[PDB]
């Protein structure tokens, strides 16, 4: 399965209105076209994705993309895959002012909610409706931020100490002491969310009134327990849902950064450049052997140059079904930066997922052998040979 | 008056400035301490020429210059050397480390906190002027300071002053020899500065001057001192029309008018003909025809480019010495008779000439021989694109793998800022390959 | 001003330090009592890099001495230069690490690290504009590895902008002095690969081979090895202290040498070495310096550069010489040996020239190479590590001090990742 | 600064202590009465080394030692001998009968009423020390006191102190010759406390030292004094790194870290290479390579066991005198090429090196030649198990018929605290067999698959 890719355009901001600008991006169906303000009517480019989203014009319903539309398009399928048993992940991307946060968080106070609370709503409704005497669910949450190559917990109370990152030899990288908390209702997780979003570190720039200074990841552990005490086993399925709100690419001459802000921007840019290299290299690695010869050339991908890539190594490649949501600025001023985002979005589409559903090996083998033996015994008994 | 302000940035600029100011002081009769005994022995004249020296009440002559660098180890040699009493004490070191061959450090993080002092000193220097004509900026590509800080300074100068001419004397990277691994990034990132804010950029190459020293001057093991002396001679030959009398004088605006057909092609080459040792100064007439033919030799160019592969768009010749216009008009004809030198179709004239009476001086301990006729040529041609193209290839080989990029990103620069610059450079190349296409 | 703080840890680092301050004192001109009795005027111009001033015109070295055994402190004090260092900087304890990495890193060093950091803060606060740190230690022991990596982590946490260097004496292939070298080496490299900007790989076997085959000594001792290491140490930093034609701060070397963050392991070299009796036959000039400098038997890391590819190399010359000759020689050594240089870096030699040579020499040169062959060394340790971790050979000494097997496993995994990273560029082809 | 208490129990321990303290006094220039005129002649120095001696106001030095026994006959020789004024009067003798080659009497019928006083004196000695390294217990298997009282004392010390190191130097029964009939019972009953509580135990044999004295020093009729002198030289070479300056120093804990792989196999053998008479001290170079080679010769071992029948798990070399690390590296390299010496595959390095500058001293009236270089080697190997097996056979031949058992049970011992010890010993004999086996071929199943 390929890494799914969604693209969305936001409307103009006051910064793009005080300094006059024009709309450069168009789209039809799943295809998006980029025009060149600097050399117009020379080489308009086009790129094909899984989803394109025109949220420029709210008053008109002509191919308008609401939050519920994007959610029903990708988050519903991700939650369905999670209910099947997969571990799933959809992470944002874009430049400072692309609306990556407006897409993954949205505004709780309005009906235009992001793709994090609507999943939570759908998950809680599904488990509440599907709960029975022989069906139960256990849901736990965690939320961590990466400020400058240090992991901080938002759910925990004030704990100044930074958290250490370890590598379980079988399970891969993880964080130690990440405050994982169980939830039983919508209101509980919502209060946890309010605390987490309030704890996140933000700062004001010339490009955005309230910008983010840290990457942020929301992890939900979902446990399906089928309780037929006579026949079945409990804790049947375990799944991981993770949504990522990356920090925006900083430009310096067009943000006004200075002092501490400049250092934060430099760290953010280093992390994003490492992520981009990982994306391109991974896409090359999965594209080549699949069609070249199948030789499995041992060019290995390197996630150790940043804690972001290290933590998200499973989601980038391996046992996870993953998708991207690139936010774009329509103004001509950002034409270069926007174009880069589009290119990276294209590099995300070629990446392949290697995801499986697995359980305890003894249970799986015993059940399969029992099914095979039952079929063979039924065939033998039906013919009088047993 | 006719006055210029010199700005030297980085180690290369500072050392070239040392050589240049040694030459000017020897030319005008100013002692290293600033006093001029010629005034008290003569009692007249204008040997305190205002083009480079400002006179105080006591009789001292302070030069119009601003030295800049981001480390103390180079400029301190000036502060404790032979010329310590000539310059003003304000020499504008940053009391920190250097840019470490990094454009981002020299343009965004460390390049600031000294730009304001430099601008204040330049403003003070220009306030004393009464007819300032232009600026002379000396720097070197491939260095963090000479690229980044020069870019910042050029932006600020263009904003502040605007109309004054801004010439450039720069050291382009060589095709083969090099002294840093990340030269192409620093050289490509500064195309915007030399292309947008500069008015006429002259370039030289270390390999070409090494070959000239090896062949013409018979120096087997040259060092940077000889290179600096040669560049100083060329700058003096350019500027001499402002200071001394002559039969035909050429101002800086005339150079810009005749060497720059369109705004974006202000990248001429420079050559200096009678480079010859004292032993070989005999056995040769060194007449006008010999020296003016020497300029067109491919082997005597100061950048490793072959003029035969392109077309000559403009040419400016500056003679210093016992030259009479008759001999000049006759050579311009012979070189127009020769077929190996190609001129574009839309420039039927081609040549500008200027003559000055003051012959070149000799630096004690130098390697050039005393001579009575010299000529400096500045030629706008299409061959320079060759020297660009090679560099672009090198850039690609390092940018495909994002080598040495995290150093630049960690200091405040964005990744896309690389690629954008490259496109600009390509566009520049494209325009020097469509001003020659014969007209139809 | 560009001021360096020096730290020494363990017996090996302490003794190497001693001989470094006997090579940096003579070059500037400092008496053992701390007074100045030099001749040239350029010796005091940049003395503040490595020396603080004291009221009687005296100069104290800006250093810090660390151990967990008083014996090495007593040996240094009872010596020719024991009285030059500040008494308050002699930080030490008792009941040393016992060749155990856990004791140095977790149990014993965790008490002394606070005092050492207090001294470091006091020393760094007095500086005008701090350049970076440098630390000398051996990876085969307990005190060195443990407290060195702990101090590196703490200092990098507190001073993130500054450049950090290390000079590591690392386990030899055949020569062995202790039995639990692989565990300590692996656990120390796991931290070194993360919390440093440059690392220089020293190996005892290479130094012994140089002393035998090049210097023709009959009975080498540790003093000669310290002599060579000190010469390289001074040559690396010569450009901060004396003027020249081309200059190279430590940061410039770091920028030009490190293409990607996890590749900062270097092979050092020095020239000329002549053996005290063959100098009358050997001429001295730039080509012969380059010839000895690029030779495989000169390198101090016991790794053959011909088994891989030079990522990037750097040469710092000291003396009065022409630039054309230097550039021509570097171009020639590039072109003749093009098989051993990576193809996607068009020019991978950094050059620097300083005017003042050492006292008794007319010319000298130092070499910092970065090549893939270093991976070989790590493989050796890795193999040995497996041979003792498959059966828990000496594990209970470590786990008894508050450690677990997961740390060993992830430490091995990180080194294997580093080896795979270095290998990726080693093989030919690759190209565009 | 780095103190070590020495505890001597039994006749063998007391006599080895006499030899050891004679050597130490000769080494540090302390007269038998405790005074040190060399310091007065020098005018000041650190010769009053705190590793073994404690200084008082008047300049007298008292050793850090604790002698214990139940027979007054042995301690009374010291109390009226040459060193009567050196030791503190507290010599801790039990003015009663002796254990009489009976483990039970030494342990918990006569070992009581004297253990408390011994522990009090050891507490005072340890309180005087400003930083301890460990203990050095000298005893002998076979004897009643040296088994039972040693077991009780180690039990109490392990309870009280716990973390501090505890070393042994013990006389194991010889394969053929013996001076008692009920030795195997005592040795087997001692092995449990030797195993659980001690941290590193060295063993020596009288027969091997007799053979060494005969072949090397050309003494046809040796006595216990020569053997005690050799053991004293071994212990001095062990502890030399704490006292004198050296290029590479090895602390007592470094031995444990580098020499014992697992907690239950801490039974190494010891050897001393340049044992040679004064007459034969000439005609020979005695270089570093020669002594290093001699350390591995099976004939020079101090326990009657062949290293060729097992495998070397680890080794530790301590050099003393004019040695330069280069020759040591060359010696180790040539040893690593021989095929007779075998090393377990899971210890590729298998060597520890330590160099000290002080050369060994010569005791007046001794039989060892004055030399300029010496080496002491400690090898942790699997051959030693063979020796144990021999002794084990003897035990069975006496326990089938319950011979000499009523003496043991008559002093408050259950019959089944015998067989129990045997089983423990058997378990130990299993482990030394298990560790020495090479790793099974491709221990992690089989490899080789897609990449
Ligand atoms: C007659 C003559 O030419 O004397 C030379 C000499 O013969 C040679 C052999 C010297 C000599 O070096 C050695 O023999 C040596 C032995 C072991 C380890 C290192 C060196 C010399 O000792 C070393 C000494 O070096 C210096 O004087 C430098 O200043 C040197 N100084 C020290 O290292 C030093 C050591 C202790 C106390 C004070 C200073 C230095 C080198 C690099 C950076 C800083 C300082 C020199 C030129 C020589 C002798 C005296 C024979 C050489 O040493 C170096 C590294 O320069 C060996 O390689 C050079 C080549 C020289 O020709
Ligand atoms: N012609 C000539 N070129 C020089 C001279 N000195 C340095 N260069 C050139 O300068 C380049 C190196 O960059 P530099 O200008 O020295 O760097 P910088 O100005 O000191 O700035 P930093 O790197 O931050 O120190 C080399 O490629 C040299 O060719 C000189 O004296 N004469
Ligand atoms: N090497 C050596 N061994 C000795 C020496 N003295 C006694 N032994 C050994 O010790 C054994 C006897 O045990 P001891 O501990 O001396 O007996 P004890 O100390 O008198 O205690 P009891 O058994 O109660 O009498 C003998 O078999 C000897 O082999 C000695 O001086 N040197
Ligand atoms: N499509 C949209 N519709 C309505 N409001 C939007 C939209 N996009 C952005 N905004 C508002 O404008 C601001 C910019 O969006 P935001 O999501 O903060 O950018 P970002 O991609 O997160 N980059 P950063 O500011 O660095 O976090 C937000 O505060 C939103 O409230
Ligand atoms: N070059 C050099 N190496 C040494 C010296 N002394 C010891 N070593 C090396 O250091 C290693 C032992 O490390 P050690 O000093 O005990 O580390 P520590 O115990 O933590 O202080 C051995 O492998 C030796 O090769 C010396 O004087 N010079
Ligand atoms: Mg955001
Ligand atoms: Mg510089
Ligand atoms: Mg007795």
Strand residue runs (E) in C51-172:
51-54, 58-61, 63-66, 90-91, 130-138, 163-170
Residues of B carrying an active site annotation:
254
Q: D57 and chain C: CB distance < 8 Å anywhere?
A: no
Cα separation, A190 vs A181, in Å, equals 13
**Sign (positive/negative) of CA torsion C221, C222, C227, C228?**
positive
Residues C292-298: contacts with CB under 8 Å, at least 24 apart: C293/C269, C293/C365, C293/C367, C294/C333, C294/C337, C294/C367, C297/C209, C297/C210, C297/C213, C297/C214, C298/C210, C298/C214, C298/C269, C298/C270, C298/C271, C298/C273, C298/C367
Q: Which two tokens stand for residue A235?
A: 């804790």
Contact D160, D34 (CB under 8 A): no
DSSP collapsed to 3 states, chain B: CCEEEEEEEHHHHHHHHHHHHHHHHHHHCCCCCCCCHHHHHHCCCCCCCCCCEEECCCCCEEECEEEEECCCCCHHHHHCCCCCCCCCCCCCECCCCCCCCCHHHHHHHCCCCCHHHHHHHHHHHHHCCCCEEEEEEECCCCCHHHHHHHHHHHHHHHHHCCCCEEEEEEECCCCCCCCCCCHHHHHHHCHHHHHHCCCEEEEECHHHHHHHHHHCCCCCCCCHHHHHHHHHHHHHHHHHHHHCCCCECCCHHHHHHHHCCCHHHCCCEEEECCCCCHHHHCCCCCCHHHHHHHHCCHHHCCCCCCHHHCCEEEEEEEEEECCCHHHHHHHHHHHHHCCCCCECCCCCCCEEEEEECCCCCCCCCCCCCCCCEEEEEEEEECCHHHHHHHHHHHHHHHHCCCCCCHHHHCCCCCCHHHHHHHHHHHHHHHHCCCCCCCCC
Q: Which one of D325, D330, D333 would you mutate to disrupt binding with C, by most C Cβ within 10 Å of its Cβ?
A: D325
**Distance of CA A272 from the midpoint of ligand 3 (Å):** 77
Instruction: With CA atoms as reference, report the closest residue to A53 among A28, A34, A75.
Output: A28
B406 contacts A340? CB cut-off 8 A: no
Q: How many residues are given for chain C?
A: 432
Phi, psi (rounded to 5 degrees) for A77: -70, -40
Q: Please report how many Cα atoms fall inside a 13 Å half-sphere around the Cα of residue D26, on the Cβ side.
A: 17
Identify which ligand lies nearest to the alpha carbon of D170: 3
Q: What is the CATH number of the domain that holds B222?
A: 3.40.50.1440
Of C131, C344, C351, the CB nearest to B97: C131
* Helix B224-243, helix B206-215: angle, nearest 10: 100
A381 and A295 together in one domain: no
* C106 DSSP 8-state letter: I
Peptide bond into D76 cis (omega under 30): no
**Distance of CA C249 from the midpoint of ligand 7 (Å):** 9
B/e letters for A23-32, b = 16+ CB within 10 Å, e = fewer, are ebbbbeeeeb
Contact B360, B237 (CB under 8 A): yes
C114 and C44 together in one domain: yes
Instruction: With CA atoms as reference, report the closest residue to B237 among B219, B255, B223.
Output: B255
D15 and D100 together in one domain: yes
Of A166, A299, A302, the CB nearest to C406: A166
- Beta-bridge mates of residue A54: A9, A64
Cα separation, B53 vs B61, in Å, equals 6
- Beta-bridge mates of residue D115: none
Residue D140 lies in a domain: yes
Q: Which one of B102, B155, B412, B426 would you mutate to disrupt binding with A, by most A Cβ within 10 Å of its Cβ?
A: B412
B144 and B68 together in one domain: yes
Cα separation, A364 vs A233, in Å, equals 12
A229 and A378 together in one domain: no
Q: A298 and chain D: CB distance < 8 Å anywhere?
A: yes
D289 and D375 together in one domain: yes
* D247 DSSP 8-state letter: S
Q: Which two tokens stand for residue B21?
A: 């100011």
Contacts of A269 in chain B (CB under 8 A): 409-410, 413-415
Residue D25 lies in a domain: yes
Binding-site residues of C for GTP, please? Answer: 11-12, 97-99, 138, 141-144, 176, 181, 204, 222, 226
> Chain A: residue nearest D451 by CA?
A296
Cα separation, C255 vs D414, in Å, equals 78
The experimental resolution of this structure, in angstroms, equals 3.0
For residue C357 and ligand 1, the question of a CB distance below 6 A is answered with no
Q: C359 and chain D: CB distance < 8 Å anywhere?
A: no
Cα separation, B331 vs A104, in Å, equals 76
B/e letters for B371-395, b = 16+ CB within 10 Å, e = fewer, are bebbbbbbbbbbbbbbbbeebeebb
Cα separation, B5 vs B63, in Å, equals 9
D243 and D202 together in one domain: yes
For residue A212 and ligand 4, the question of a CB distance below 6 A is answered with yes
Instruction: With CA atoms as reference, report the closest residue to C225 among C294, C281, C300, C172.
Output: C300
* C341 DSSP 8-state letter: B
**D27 CA to centre of own chain:** 20
| Three-state SS at C419 | helix
B57 and B17 together in one domain: yes
A320 and A377 together in one domain: no
Instruction: With CA atoms as reference, report the closest residue to C209 among C168, C174, C235, C167.
Output: C174
Cα separation, C227 vs C245, in Å, equals 28
Identify which ligand lies nearest to the alpha carbon of C69: 5
Residue-range definition of the domain harbouring residue A38? 4-355
**Burial zone of B123 (CB within 10 Å; 0-12 exposed, 13-18 middle, 19+ buried):** exposed
β A321-328/A165-168 pair status: unpaired
Give the total number of structural domains in chain A. Answer: 2
Q: What is the CATH number of the domain that holds B319?
A: 3.30.1330.20
C402 and C359 together in one domain: no
Contact B228, B222 (CB under 8 A): no
D109 and D214 together in one domain: yes
A55 and A94 together in one domain: yes
A336 and A376 together in one domain: no
Residue D73 lies in a domain: yes
Please provide the DSSP assignment of D390-433 as one string. Answer: HHHHHHHHHHTTTTT-HHHHTTT--GGGTHHHHHHHHHHHHHHH
Instruction: With CA atoms as reference, report the closest residue to C99 among C179, C167, C175.
Output: C179
Residue D162: CB atoms within 10 Å:
8
Q: A260 and chain C: CB distance < 8 Å anywhere?
A: no
> Chain A: residue nearest B420 by CA?
A336
Instruction: With CA atoms as reference, report the closest residue to B151 among B14, B313, B9.
Output: B9
Please provide the DSSP assignment of D251-316 as one string. Answer: -HHHHHHHH-SSTT----EEEES----HHHHSS----HHHHHHHHT-GGG-SSS--GGGS-EEEEE
Residue C326: CB atoms within 10 Å:
25
**Burial zone of B119 (CB within 10 Å; 0-12 exposed, 13-18 middle, 19+ buried):** middle
A382 and A334 together in one domain: no
A252 and A317 together in one domain: yes
Contacts of A249 in chain B (CB under 8 A): 414
| Planar angle of CA C54, C59, C61, nearest 5 degrees | 115
B400 contacts C345? CB cut-off 8 A: no
Ligand 5 atom 14, closest CA: C141
D50 and D176 together in one domain: yes
C180 contacts D257? CB cut-off 8 A: yes
Contact D193, D201 (CB under 8 A): no
Among residues D383, D408, D424, the one where a domain terminates is D383
- Beta-bridge mates of residue D171: D140, D204
Give the distance from residue D236's alpha carbon to the nearest chain A alpha carbon, in angstroms. Answer: 47
Give the total number of structural domains in chain D. Answer: 3
A308 and A382 together in one domain: no
Q: Please list all protein residues whose beta carbon sits less than 5 angstroms from ligand 6, which is an ion.
A: A 101, 212
Method: cryo-EM
Residue-range definition of the domain harbouring residue D277? 269-383
Cα separation, B115 vs C17, in Å, equals 41
Q: Where are the alpha helices (DSSP H) in D4-102?
A: 10-28, 37-42, 72-79
Ligand 5 atom 6, closest CA: C12
Cα separation, A293 vs C363, in Å, equals 56
Q: What is the CATH number of the domain that holds D409?
A: 1.10.287.600
Tell the residue number behind the tokens 């210029």, with chain if given: B4
D212 and D279 together in one domain: no
C208 and C164 together in one domain: yes
Cα separation, D138 vs D187, in Å, equals 15
Of B108, B402, B410, the CB nearest to A252: B108
Q: C175 and chain D: CB distance < 8 Å anywhere?
A: yes
C235 and C322 together in one domain: no
Instruction: Ligand 3 pocket test: pick from D16, D139, D140 the residue with the most ligand atoms within 8 Å of its Cβ.
Output: D140
Tell the residue number behind the tokens 């789209």, with chain if given: A27
Q: Cα–Cα distances in Å, from D140 out to D53, D97, D101, D155, D223?
A: 25, 19, 11, 17, 17
β A4-9/A51-54 pair status: parallel
| Three-state SS at D375 | strand
Instruction: With CA atoms as reference, report the closest residue to C319 among C263, C347, C370, C359.
Output: C359
C362 and C319 together in one domain: yes
C379 and C348 together in one domain: no
Among residues C214, C237, C259, the one where a domain terminates is C259
Phi, psi (rounded to 5 degrees) for C290: -65, -40
Cα separation, D160 vs D116, in Å, equals 13
- Beta-bridge mates of residue C246: C353
Q: Please report how many Cα atoms fall inside a 13 Å half-sphere around the Cα of residue A116, on the Cβ side.
A: 29
Q: Cα–Cα distances in Å, from A61 out to A30, A130, A155?
A: 17, 35, 39
Residue D451 lies in a domain: no
**Distance of CA C26 from the midpoint of ligand 5 (Å):** 26
Among residues C212, C242, C259, the one where a domain terminates is C259
Instruction: With CA atoms as reference, report the closest residue to D211 among D306, D309, D308, D304.
Output: D304
Cα separation, D318 vs D356, in Å, equals 8
Residue D298 lies in a domain: yes
Q: Which one of A252, A262, A278, A306 would you mutate to disrupt binding with B, by most B Cβ within 10 Å of its Cβ?
A: A252
Contact B346, B238 (CB under 8 A): no
C289 and C424 together in one domain: no
Of B96, B221, B393, the CB nearest to C324: B221
Residues in contact with C295: Cβ distance below 8 Å, sequence separation at least 6, in sequence order: none
Identify which ligand lies nearest to the alpha carbon of A208: 4
Q: Is A99 a catalytic residue?
A: yes
Give the distance from residue B112's alpha carbon to the nearest chain C alpha carbon, in angstroms. Answer: 17
Contact B301, B208 (CB under 8 A): yes
Residue-range definition of the domain harbouring residue C352? 260-373
A158 and A295 together in one domain: yes
Give the distance from residue A265's alpha carbon to the nearest chain B alpha carbon, in angstroms. Answer: 7
C247 and C368 together in one domain: no
Contacts of D450 in chain A (CB under 8 A): 296
D350 and D436 together in one domain: no
Cα separation, D204 vs A375, in Å, equals 72
A273 and A377 together in one domain: no
B339 and B423 together in one domain: no
**Distance of CA C145 from the midpoint of ligand 5 (Å):** 11
Q: Which two tokens stand for residue D223?
A: 């006595």
Q: Cα–Cα distances in Å, from D149 out to C25, C382, D154, D269?
A: 62, 48, 8, 24
Phi, psi (rounded to 5 degrees) for C371: -140, 165
D365 and D407 together in one domain: no
Q: A296 and chain D: CB distance < 8 Å anywhere?
A: yes
Q: What is the CATH number of the domain that holds C17?
A: 3.40.50.1440
Q: What is the CATH number of the domain that holds A346?
A: 3.40.850.10
Give the distance from residue C272's alpha carbon to the nearest chain D alpha carbon, in angstroms. Answer: 24
Instruction: With CA atoms as reference, report the closest residue to D287 among D315, D323, D317, D318.
Output: D323
> Chain C: residue nearest D252 by CA?
C98
Cα separation, A358 vs A354, in Å, equals 13
D192 and D61 together in one domain: yes
Among residues D383, D405, D424, the one where a domain terminates is D383
Instruction: With CA atoms as reference, report the closest residue to B420 among C173, D4, A38.
Output: A38
Contact A53, A46 (CB under 8 A): no
Q: Cα–Cα distances in Å, from A207 out to A18, A175, A212, B353?
A: 13, 33, 11, 54
Phi, psi (rounded to 5 degrees) for B61: -120, 110
Contacts of C390 in chain D (CB under 8 A): 346, 439, 443-444
C218 and C71 together in one domain: yes
């Amino acid at each position: 399965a390929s890494v799914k890719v969604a693209v969305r355009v936001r409307p103009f901001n006051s910064r793009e209105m005080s300094r006059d600008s024009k709309c450069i991006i168009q789209m039809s169906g799943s295809t998006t076209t980029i025009v060149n303000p600097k050399q117009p009517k020379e080489t308009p480019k086009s790129f094909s994705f899984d989803y394109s989203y025109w949220s420029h014009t709210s008053p008109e319903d002509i191919n308008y993309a609401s939050q519920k539309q994007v959610y029903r398009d990708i988050g519903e399928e991700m939650l369905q895959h999670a209910f099947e048993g997969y571990n799933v992940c959809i992470f944002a991307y874009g430049q400072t002012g692309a609306g990556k946060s407006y897409t993954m968080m949205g505004k709780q106070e309005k009906d235009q909610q992001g793709i994090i609370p609507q999943l939570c709503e759908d998950l809680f409704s599904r488990i509440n409706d599907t709960t029975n005497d022989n069906m139960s669910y256990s849901v736990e949450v965690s939320y961590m931020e990466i400020y400058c190559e240090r992991v901080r917990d938002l759910l925990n109370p004030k704990n100044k100490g930074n958290l250490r990152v370890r590598e379980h030899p079988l399970l891969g990288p993880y964080v130690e002491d990440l405050s994982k908390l169980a939830v039983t209702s919508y209101n509980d997780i919502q209060d946890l969310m309010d605390s987490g979003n309030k704890a996140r570190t933000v700062a004001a720039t010339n490009m955005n009134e309230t910008s983010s200074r840290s990457h942020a990841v929301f992890n939900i552990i979902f446990t399906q327990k089928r309780h037929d005490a006579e026949t079945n086993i409990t804790t049947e399925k375990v799944s991981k849902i993770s949504l990522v709100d990356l920090a925006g690419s900083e430009r310096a001459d067009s943000t006004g950064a200075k002092g501490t802000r400049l250092k934060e921007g430099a760290n953010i840019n280093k992390s994003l450049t490492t992520l981009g290299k990982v994306i391109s290299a991974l896409a090359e690695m999965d594209s080549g052997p699949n069609k070249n010869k199948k030789k499995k050339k041992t060019d290995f991908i390197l996630y150790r140059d940043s804690v972001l890539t290290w933590l998200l190594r499973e989601n980038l490649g391996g046992n996870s079904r993953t998708a991207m949501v690139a936010a774009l600025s329509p103004a001509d001023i950002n034409y270069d930066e926007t174009l880069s985002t589009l290119r990276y979005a294209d590099r995300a589409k070629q990446i392949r997922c290697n995801a499986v559903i697995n359980e305890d090996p003894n249970n799986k083998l015993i059940r399969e052998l029992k099914d095979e033996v039952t079929r063979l015994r039924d065939l033998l008994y039906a013919q009088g040979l047993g | 008056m006719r006055e210029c302000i010199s700005i030297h940035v980085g180690q290369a600029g500072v050392q070239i400035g040392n050589a240049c100011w040694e030459l000017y002081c020897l030319e005008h009769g100013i002692q290293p301490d600033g006093q001029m005994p010629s005034d008290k022995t003569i009692g007249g004249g204008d040997d305190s020429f205002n083009t480079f020296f400002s006179e105080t009440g006591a009789g001292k002559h302070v030069p119009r210059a601003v030295f800049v660098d981001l480390e103390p180890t180079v400029i301190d040699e000036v502060r404790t050397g032979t010329y310590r009493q000539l310059f003003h004490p304000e020499q504008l070191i940053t009391g920190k480390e250097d840019a470490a061959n990094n454009y981002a450090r020299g343009h965004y993080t460390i390049g600031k906190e000294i730009i304001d002092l430099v601008l204040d000193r330049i403003r003070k220097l220009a306030d004393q002027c009464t007819g300032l004509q232009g600026f002379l900026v000396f720097h070197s590509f491939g260095g963090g300071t000479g690229s980044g800080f020069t870019s910042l300074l050029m932006e600020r100068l263009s904003v502040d002053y605007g109309k004054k001419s801004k010439l450039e004397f720069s050291i382009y990277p060589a095709p083969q020899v090099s002294t840093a691994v990340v030269e192409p990034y620093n050289s490509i990132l500064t195309t915007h500065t030399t292309l947008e804010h500069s008015d006429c950029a002259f370039m030289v190459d270390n390999e070409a001057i090494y070959d000239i020293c090896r062949r013409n001057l018979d120096i087997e093991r040259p060092t940077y001192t000889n290179l600096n002396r040669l560049i100083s001679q060329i700058v003096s030959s350019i500027t001499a029309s402002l200071r001394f009398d002559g039969a035909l004088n050429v101002d800086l605006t005339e150079f810009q008018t005749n060497l720059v057909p369109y705004p974006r092609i202000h990248f001429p080459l420079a050559t200096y003909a009678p480079v010859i040792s004292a032993e070989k100064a005999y056995h040769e007439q060194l007449s006008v025809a010999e020296i003016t033919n020497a300029c067109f030799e491919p082997a005597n160019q100061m950048v490793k480019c072959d003029p035969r592969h392109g077309k000559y768009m403009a040419c400016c010749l500056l003679y210093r010495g016992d030259v009479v216009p008759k001999d000049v008009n006759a050579a311009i004809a012979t070189i127009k008779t020769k077929r190996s030198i190609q001129f574009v179709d839309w420039c039927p004239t081609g040549f500008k000439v200027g003559i000055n009476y003051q012959p070149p001086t000799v630096v004690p301990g130098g390697d050039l021989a005393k001579v009575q006729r010299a000529v400096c040529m500045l030629s706008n041609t299409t061959a320079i694109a060759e020297a660009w193209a090679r560099l672009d290839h090198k850039f690609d080989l390092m940018y495909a793998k994002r080598a040495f990029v995290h150093w630049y990103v960690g200091e405040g620069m964005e990744e896309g800022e690389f690629s954008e610059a490259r496109e600009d450079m390509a566009a520049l190349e494209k325009d020097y390959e469509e001003v020659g296409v014969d007209s139809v | 001003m560009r001021e360096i703080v020096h730290i020494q840890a363990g017996q090996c680092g302490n003794q190497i330090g001693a001989k470094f301050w006997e090579v940096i004192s003579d070059e500037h001109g400092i008496d053992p009592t701390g007074s100045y009795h030099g001749d040239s005027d350029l010796q005091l111009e940049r003395i503040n890099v490595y020396y603080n001033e004291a009221t009687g015109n005296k100069y104290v070295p800006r250093a810090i001495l660390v151990d967990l055994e008083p014996g090495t402190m007593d040996s240094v004090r009872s010596g020719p230069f024991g009285q030059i260092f500040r008494p308050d900087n002699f930080v030490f304890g008792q009941s040393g690490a016992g060749n155990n990495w856990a004791k140095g890193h977790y149990t014993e060093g965790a008490e002394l690290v606070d005092s050492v950091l207090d001294v470091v803060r006091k020393e760094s606060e007095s500086c005008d504009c701090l350049q970076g740190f440098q630390l000398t230690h051996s990876l085969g022991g307990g005190t060195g590895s443990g407290m060195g990596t702990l101090l590196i982590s703490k200092i990098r946490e507190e001073y993130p902008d500054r450049i950090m260097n290390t000079f590591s004496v690392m386990p030899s292939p055949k020569v062995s002095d202790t039995v639990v070298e692989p565990y300590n080496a692996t656990l120390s490299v796991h931290q070194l690969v993360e919390n440093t900007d440059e690392t220089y790989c020293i190996d005892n076997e290479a130094l012994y081979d140089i002393c035998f085959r090049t210097l023709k000594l009959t009975t080498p001792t540790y003093g000669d090895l310290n002599h060579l290491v000190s010469a390289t140490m001074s040559g690396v930093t010569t450009c901060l202290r004396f003027p020249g034609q081309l200059n190279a701060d430590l940061r410039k070397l770091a920028v030009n040498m490190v293409p990607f963050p996890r590749l900062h392991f270097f092979m050092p070299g020095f020239a000329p070495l002549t053996s005290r009796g063959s100098q009358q036959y050997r001429a001295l000039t730039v080509p012969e310096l380059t010839q000895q400098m690029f030779d495989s038997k000169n390198m101090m890391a016991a790794c053959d550069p011909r088994h891989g590819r030079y990522l990037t190399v750097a040469a710092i010359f000291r003396g009065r010489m022409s630039m054309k000759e230097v550039d021509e020689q570097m171009l020639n050594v590039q072109n003749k040996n093009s098989s051993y240089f990576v193809e996607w870096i068009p020019n991978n030699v950094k050059t620097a020239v300083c005017d003042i040579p050492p006292r008794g020499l007319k010319m000298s040169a130092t070499f910092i190479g970065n090549s893939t062959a270093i991976q070989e060394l790590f493989k050796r340790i890795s193999e040995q590590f497996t041979a003792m971790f498959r059966r828990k050979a000496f594990l209970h000494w470590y786990t008894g001090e508050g450690m677990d097997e997961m740390e060993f496993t992830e430490a091995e995994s990180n080194m294997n990742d580093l080896v795979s990273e270095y290998q990726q560029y080693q093989d030919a082809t690759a190209d565009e």
